[PDB]
């Protein structure tokens with residue numbers, strides 16, 4: 270039974286590299302999967318303020334190259350989705 274809301278995506282090379290560091294290599298991922306893995310990448314590289322864990326600092330990491338920003342709050346969903354879509358194509 271199909272989820273009509275699902276999004277299937279093919280990541281650009283740098284995003285694929287970050288996904289493979291934390292997760293499995295696939296040709297296509299779902300958006301939910303990409304969001305999960307990006308969050309888990311931030312957790313394992315400790316790219317947040319220990320005292321303010323909803324703020325991400327990514328400028329000193331490939332994630333900052335991927336997103337094109339030095340930092341962001343996890344509340345900034347439009348920004349985060351927008352930067353993610355700039356790093357993939359929808360299948």
Ligand SMILES: COc1ccc(C2=N[C@@H](c3ccc(Cl)c(Cl)c3)[C@@H](c3ccc(Cl)c(Cl)c3)N2C(=O)N2CCNC(=O)C2)c(OC(C)C)c1
Pocket residue numbers: 303304305307308309311312317322323324325342343344345346347349350
């Ligand atoms: C209080 O500390 C927090 C509170 C909320 C989030 C958290 N927000 C989720 C999310 C979803 C969509 C968008 Cl569009 C954005 Cl912006 C953020 C998700 C996540 C996904 C992708 C990215 Cl890129 C980022 Cl930053 C964050 N997400 C987590 O991954 N969490 C929380 C649940 N379980 C976890 O283990 C980790 C949070 O995330 C950390 C990694 C900074 C911290």
Ligand SMILES: [Cl-]
Pocket residue numbers: 274275276277299300301302
């Ligand atoms: Cl999805």
Ligand SMILES: [Cl-]
Pocket residue numbers: 281282283284
């Ligand atoms: Cl790229």
Ligand SMILES: [Cl-]
Pocket residue numbers: 345348
């Ligand atoms: Cl914003």
Ligand code: NA
Pocket residue numbers: 318320321324
């Ligand atoms: Na902070």
Ligand code: NA
Pocket residue numbers: 358359360
């Ligand atoms: Na496409």
